[PDB]
Design a protein around this ligand. Structure first.
Ligand SMILES: COc1ccc(Nc2cc(-c3cnc(N)nc3)nc(N3CCOCC3)n2)cc1OC
Length: 840
């Protein structure tokens, strides 16, 4: 269809990849998935309520924080309402439905609805107004709720376009590389299931040349019948170091044994190791420069009491952390007692790791074992436990499915919290179509906020990842067909803006080189280049990718500028597109840093906050919006009235930092109109400082330069630029005499310092109860998100930091000890960091 191809071509530009391209595939798996996702899509599009979907209400079922309910006081809430005239305030009960409030507003005066001024947000459906996330946000900021009486959006804008017992063996013919001194080479063939190697065979070393021919049958111990679904054939070339690797599913999406001739273009590695890239079933799209290996496959297949002491033995095995390796005896015990182990959900990840997947009999029993789901099905949802089963350790679709089952109950605000990690978890899936993928698809189509972030998280991987881009493109294309024409329009104009600006970002960086800072000609060029973009192409308005609630209008070209960083990032400001708002929308465009890392780190910060909320703790973290738009390129939210802690020192002392503890406090008063807001700043600081002290310490990002820490004029302090630190005289975290001086302590105790410690302890202990969740989120992040090869060692930093197994008291002191390490060297580390900046 003429108009059907233009619609597909439209999808291609939004996706950033062409899913109609079969050039890179040795089979139909991707295409089979594109069609497979057709059903679960149209099913969700038909399920969602048009009105609620159009207004995408953002709500939470979580209990109101214990500290905030105190703010409720009289049990009355002030809510302002304006249409063109009326400023009149109406007092409503916390449990009152927005609709019932209209009936109350119709009495003082329904086809009209309540919207939030300056943003696109709607209070709608039946939920208590206390359950609306945006409302809770105003309270925490000590802000009054301002709502505009408005007409509901037309749901018609959301309409979607009409739609053998023999042993296994493989013949290695040879390898070929287009181009390159007397070296040696051999191929390694592994049969892998969930990172576990079932059988291994290597060829005989042959002289390394542009072509090497073997034609040898590599025979394996494993029988064809014993091959578990999701099993990978891992082919690896060896120089004794690994050169290239490629993967082929021995059993396809159709449950068929893979058969016939295959020529696979492999991936090249980097020598100096857990990486999600090594798992990909995708062949290298570049056939020009990539090594290839030819193989042949021909196999014909059409298809009660537990002794007290041992109980104590596995219970301890169940109780150990996710990163605790299971010994041989560990697994045998778990398995023989599996029916007992099935009563403990927390033991599942370890139990299914005790399964021998290279045996059909065992796998079958494993299914008989899953046949009784009672304990698991009825158990309270545990994310850290659920996600544990979604990682690289499990290739079995049925095992992974039970995890996806639990996720079904997360609803909306929890999905957003874990959305990023879940999207990354797709890389662990053996097949393109999967329960997890279908889960993400459905949830994205059901909610616009979840769908918006789904879009960008997928585009991020599609752009900079040649390994998973094909699978993700297929998933994104699926979503784009069900999201409606309105969103398709929003994404379109968001993508245009992003492309125009990135071009400017890179063109600006190419000048001024690495150093020498900013030329007057570089300032001018940007000013001109922007007005040239504002002239024609740039959309009159666009939705802010990291905050879809925000609609950005025309640029402020006078407010824009190039930053002093050696990476010459852009500082951009847009006028608010919504007339019901003055304050501009700040955004930073940077190249040369990998913002996928920043992205992941920031998402964990938001997760730590949620944990602290249930514990009735508000640490005032400031997880600013960050979106990776491509390779070493992306956008960053600008927190208003915020400056670096380094600039505050230079504003007083001078070029190179020397002491001056008092400077910190001096700045806070200067930026405080009234001591009332100064004492409020000190309060905001002591909490925020505590938050980032505990959070950063756990993630191992605790030790940072003075220039990577910022503070708002209102006292809120927050870290930035998490990209390099994870790969690059340590200090547990940053705690400085200048920070202490604001608390009243000098290298000695103060009322605020005691407050500080009590906060840290309560915050640090509240995380340890979640220890497993943090461990798996952390390890996953390293595997999917860290280009630098993640090892068993790096992932184990968070085990020590969280003091696993240590007494809650023993841990309480352990953290109070880390604080003591800070005062021991006050400026020592920061002074070296300042010395490290020059060299070297
Ligand atoms: C007031 O002075 C400055 C204020 C900020 C910066 N630089 C950066 C640098 C970065 C940054 C963030 N992420 C990464 N990867 N690299 C850099 N982010 C910000 N902001 C984001 C949060 O809201 C505040 C702004 N600012 C530099 C300054 O002087 C050189």
């Amino acid at each position: 269809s003429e108009e059907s191809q233009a619609f597909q071509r439209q999808l291609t530009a939004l996706i950033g990849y062409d899913v109609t391209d079969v050039s890179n595939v040795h089979d139909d798996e991707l295409e089979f998935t594109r069609r497979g996702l057709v059903t679960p899509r149209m099913a969700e599009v038909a399920s969602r309520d048009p009105k609620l979907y159009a207004m995408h209400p953002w709500v939470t079922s979580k209990p109101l924080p214990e500290y905030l309910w105190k703010k409720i006081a009289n049990n009355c809430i002030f809510i302002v309402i304006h249409r063109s005239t009326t400023s009149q305030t109406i007092k409503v009960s916390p449990d009152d439905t927005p609709g019932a409030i209209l009936q109350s507003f119709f009495t003082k005066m329904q086809d009209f609805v309540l919207r939030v001024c300056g943003r696109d947000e709607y209070l709608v459906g039946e939920t208590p107004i206390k359950n609306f996330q945006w409302v809770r946000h105003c309270l925490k900021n000590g802000e009054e709720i301002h709502v505009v009486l408005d007409t509901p959006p037309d749901p018609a804008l959301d309409e979607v376009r009409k739609e053998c017992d023999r042993k296994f063996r493989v013949k290695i013919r040879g390898i070929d590389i287009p181009v390159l001194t007397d070296l040696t080479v051999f191929v390694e063939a592994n049969i892998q299931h969930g990172q576990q190697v079932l059988c291994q065979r290597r060829t005989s070393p042959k002289p390394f040349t542009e072509e090497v021919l073997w034609n040898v049958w590599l025979e394996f111990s494993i029988k064809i019948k014993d091959l578990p679904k999701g099993a990978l054939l891992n082919l690896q070339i060896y120089c004794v170091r690994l050169l290239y690797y490629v993967n082929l599913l021995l059993i396809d999406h159709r449950f068929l044994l893979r058969r016939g001739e295959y020529v696979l273009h492999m991936w090249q590695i980097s020598g100096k190791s857990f990486n999600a890239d090594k798992l990909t079933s995708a062949t290298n799209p570049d056939k020009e420069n990539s090594m290839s290996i030819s193989i042949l496959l021909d196999n014909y297949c059409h298809p009660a009491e537990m002794p007290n002491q041992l109980r104590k033995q596995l219970e301890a095995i169940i109780a150990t952390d996710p990163l605790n390796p299971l010994t041989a005896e560990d697994k045998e015990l778990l398995w023989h007692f599996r029916y007992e182990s099935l009563k403990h959900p927390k033991a599942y990840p370890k139990l299914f790791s005790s399964v021998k997947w290279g045996q059909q009999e065992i796998v079958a029993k494993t299914y008989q074992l899953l046949a009784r789901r009672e304990v698991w099905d009825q158990s309270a949802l545990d994310v850290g436990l659920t996600m544990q089963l979604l990682d690289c350790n499990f290739s079995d679709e049925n095992v992974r499915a039970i995890a996806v089952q639990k996720l079904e109950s997360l609803e909306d605000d929890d999905v957003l919290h874990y959305l990023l990690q879940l999207v990354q978890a797709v890389k662990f899936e053996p097949y393109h179509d999967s329960a997890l993928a279908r889960f993400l698809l459905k949830r994205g189509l059901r909610n616009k906020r979840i769908g918006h972030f789904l879009f960008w998280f997928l585009r991020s991987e599609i752009a900079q990842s040649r390994h998973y881009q094909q699978r993700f493109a297929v998933i994104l294309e699926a979503y784009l067909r069900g999201c409606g024409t309105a969103m398709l329009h929003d994404f379109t104009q968001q993508v245009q803006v992003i492309e125009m600006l990135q071009k400017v970002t890179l063109d600006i960086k190419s000048l001024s080189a690495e150093k020498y800072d900013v030329s007057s000609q570089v300032i001018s060029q940007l000013k001109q280049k922007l007005e040239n973009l504002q002239n024609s192409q740039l959309p009159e308005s666009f939705r802010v990718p990291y905050d879809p609630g925000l609609k950005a209008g025309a640029l402020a070209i006078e407010k824009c500028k190039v930053m002093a960083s050696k990476k010459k990032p852009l500082w951009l400001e847009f006028k608010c597109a919504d007339p019901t708002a003055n304050e501009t929308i700040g955004i930073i465009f940077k190249h040369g840093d990998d913002l996928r890392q920043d992205m992941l780190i920031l998402q964990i910060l938001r997760i730590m906050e949620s944990i602290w909320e249930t514990e009735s703790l508000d640490l005032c973290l400031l997880p600013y919006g960050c979106i990776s738009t491509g390779d070493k390129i992306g956008m960053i939210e600008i927190v208003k009235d915020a400056t670096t802690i380094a600039k505050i020192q230079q504003s007083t002392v001078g070029n190179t930092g020397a002491f001056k503890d008092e400077v910190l406090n001096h700045w806070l008063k200067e930026k405080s109109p009234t001591e009332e807001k100064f004492q409020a700043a000190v309060e905001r600081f002591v909490y925020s400082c505590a938050g980032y002290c505990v959070a950063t310490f756990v993630l191992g990002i605790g030790d940072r330069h003075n220039d990577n820490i910022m503070i708002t004029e209102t006292g809120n302090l927050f870290h930035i630029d998490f990209g390099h630190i994870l790969g690059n005289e340590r200090v547990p975290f940053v705690l400085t005499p200048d920070f202490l001086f604001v608390m009243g302590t000098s290298g000695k105790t103060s009322p605020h310092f005691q407050k500080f410690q009590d906060i840290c302890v309560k915050a640090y202990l509240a995380l340890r109860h979640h220890t497993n969740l943090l461990i798996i989120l952390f390890s996953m992040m390293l595997m999917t998100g860290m280009p630098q090869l993640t090892s068993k060692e790096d992932i184990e930093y968070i085990r020590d930091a969280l003091t696993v197994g240590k007494n809650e008291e023993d841990a309480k002191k352990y953290f109070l000890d880390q604080i003591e390490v800070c005062r021991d060297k006050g400026w020592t580390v920061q002074f070296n960091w300042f010395l490290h900046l020059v060299l070297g």
